[PDB]
């Protein structure tokens, strides 16, 4: 009875967004003559202005909305819980001329994979957690996460969240870092700057660390703080495309095929951060505050295990990680950076894929729960449509 196949078969009557905005017709002026550069699918009925899924977006049905031509909105329908969980090759998804360069080389670490070398913990991501010896989190080697991005509040100069470098031009982060009115947070481009290529938070890293400006900030349409922080997802373009170094390199994106196979293959994940989430919370000086980038290998534990741990509802776009709650074996809730990356290394091509964007996940100061994360595999078609909105 619930919506299957992600709305590709839907012909019922509903033509407005999740947030309450009017759907421009598919036969309308800008939605026709101006918007068409995609190889759409001619299997879905393109009726009037009804929400449909002609590109087969893993997020579902959508429409173009009244605004600056190109803008689009998702429509709140009753989808079925499609639990994603039960050389060195790559193919480019987005067109390099708008997503920037780096895609065709993503994941491959300058100072590791490309040097035919391993990091001190990557030969640990490939085992099922062996029990007893939990190799704790700690000081990160240099160049260990070349996608690791910091998000600074311009003035009065302040660090807000972590983030991920996907290409020379684009970065992904949690949407709550920027828009969150339970906290007043209504940040815009002008208030924010990023520092890419840093390993130490405080100290200045000469020539190494670059620092850049933001151009436009896209908060993904189906974002709702109003309940549980669903779709904690925001995308920000850079004013000035960054030059890849040995300390700067983008991270690859999984789709359903790739994310699932990673999950079926993998046993763990990596949260590189600074203690940002941990610390921001005025959970405060709960002891130290790591001066240097931090790293930890976190096992994903099965959905039924995660659902039972919290009060609230895990959506198939949110996912757990970490170790067991214990009297004398304590886990690591609220880990790394807000909107920071949680990653996995594809054994199928030795590349690194970002699987998780971190969240406030109240199972945090619960003090015996799992860290909750946001899934990344659904964004690909949305991203595609967003960058197409920009142009050369
Ligand atoms: C945030 O505040 C600015 C005030 O200049 C306003 O233009 C904008 O619409 C606000 N954004 C949201 C999402 O409320």
From Swiss-Prot:
* Tissue expression as described in the entry: Expressed by the liver and secreted in plasma.
The glycosylation sites annotated in the UniProt record are 186
Q: Where in the cell is it found?
A: Secreted, Extracellular space
Query: Domain Kringle: where?
Result: 2-80
UniProt record similarity statement = Belongs to the peptidase S1 family.
Catalytic reaction annotation: Selective cleavage of Arg-|-Gly bonds in fibrinogen to form fibrin and release fibrinopeptides A and B
Q: How does it assemble?
A: Heterodimer (named alpha-thrombin) of a light and a heavy chain; disulfide-linked. Forms a heterodimer with SERPINA5. In plasma, interacts (via N-terminus) with alpha-1-microglobulin with molar ratio 1:2 and 1:1; this interaction does not prevent the activation of prothrombin to thrombin. Interacts (thrombin) with iripin-8, a serine protease inhibitor from Ixodes ricinus saliva. Interacts (thrombin) with iripin-3, a serine protease inhibitor from Ixodes ricinus saliva.
Instruction: State start and end of the fragment within the whole protein.
Output: 212 to 622 of 622
CC per GO annotation? blood microparticle; collagen-containing extracellular matrix; endoplasmic reticulum lumen; extracellular exosome; extracellular region; extracellular space; Golgi lumen; plasma membrane
Name of the protein: Prothrombin
Q: Where is the stretch described as High affinity receptor-binding region which is also known as the TP508 peptide?
A: 321-343
Other remarks on record? Thrombin can itself cleave the N-terminal fragment (fragment 1) of the prothrombin, prior to its activation by factor Xa.
**Start and end of every Peptidase S1 domain?**
134-388
Where does this chain mainly localize?
A: secreted
Q: How is its activity regulated?
A: Activity is promoted in the presence of negatively charged surfaces, such as polyphosphate and dextran sulfate. Inhibited by SERPINA5.
What EC number(s) does the entry state?
3.4.21.5
The GO terms describing molecular function are: calcium ion binding; growth factor activity; heparin binding; lipopolysaccharide binding; receptor ligand activity; serine-type endopeptidase activity; signaling receptor binding; thrombospondin receptor activity
**Effect on the protein upon substituting residue 195 to C:** In FA2D; Quick-1
Superkingdom of the organism of origin: Eukaryota
- Site residues (Cleavage), renumbered to this chain: 133-134
């Amino acid at each position: 009875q619930c919506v299957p196949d992600r709305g590709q078969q839907y012909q019922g009557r509903l033509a407005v967004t999740t947030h309450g905005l009017p759907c421009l017709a598919w036969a309308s002026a800008q939605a026709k003559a101006l918007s068409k550069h995609q190889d759409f699918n001619s299997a879905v009925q393109l009726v009037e202005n009804f929400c449909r899924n002609p590109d087969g977006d893993e997020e579902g049905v959508w429409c173009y909305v009244a605004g600056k031509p190109g803008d689009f909105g998702y429509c709140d329908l009753n989808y079925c819980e499609e639990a994603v969980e039960e050389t060195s090759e790559y193919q480019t998804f987005f067109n390099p001329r708008t997503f920037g360069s780096g895609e065709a080389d993503c994941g491959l670490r300058p100072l590791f994979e490309k040097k035919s070398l391993e990091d001190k913990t990557e030969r640990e991501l490939l085992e099922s957690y062996i029990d007893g010896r939990i190799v704790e989190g700690s000081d990160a080697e240099i160049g260990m996460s070349p996608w690791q991005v910091m998000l600074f509040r311009k003035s009065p100069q302040e660090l807000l969240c972590g983030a991920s470098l996907i290409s020379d031009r684009w970065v992904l982060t949690a949407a709550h870092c920027l828009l969150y009115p339970p906290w007043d947070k209504n940040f815009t481009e002008n208030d924010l700057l990023v520092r890419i290529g840093k390993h130490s938070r405080t100290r200045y890293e000469r020539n190494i660390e670059k620092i850049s400006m933001l151009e436009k900030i896209y908060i993904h349409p189906r974002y709702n703080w109003r309940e549980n922080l669903d779709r904690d997802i925001a995308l920000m373009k850079l004013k000035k495309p960054v030059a890849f170094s040995d300390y700067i390199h983008p991270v690859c994106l999984p789709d359903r095929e790739t994310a699932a196979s990673l999950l079926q293959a993998g046993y763990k994940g990596r949260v590189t951060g600074w203690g940002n989430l941990k610390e921001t919370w005025t959970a405060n000086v709960g002891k130290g505050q790591p001066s240097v980038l931090q790293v930890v290998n976190l096992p994903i534990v099965e959905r039924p295990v995660c659902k039972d741990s919290t009060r609230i509802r895990i959506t198939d776009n949110m996912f757990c990680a970490g170790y067991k709650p214990d009297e004398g074996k304590r886990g690591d809730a609220c880990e790394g950076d807000a909107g920071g990356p949680f990653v996995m290394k594809s054994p199928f091509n030795n590349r690194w894929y970002q699987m998780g964007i971190v969240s406030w996940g109240e199972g945090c100061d619960r003090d015996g729960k799992y860290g909750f994360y946001t899934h990344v595999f659904r964004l690909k078609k949305w991203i595609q449509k967003v960058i197409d909105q920009f142009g050369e």
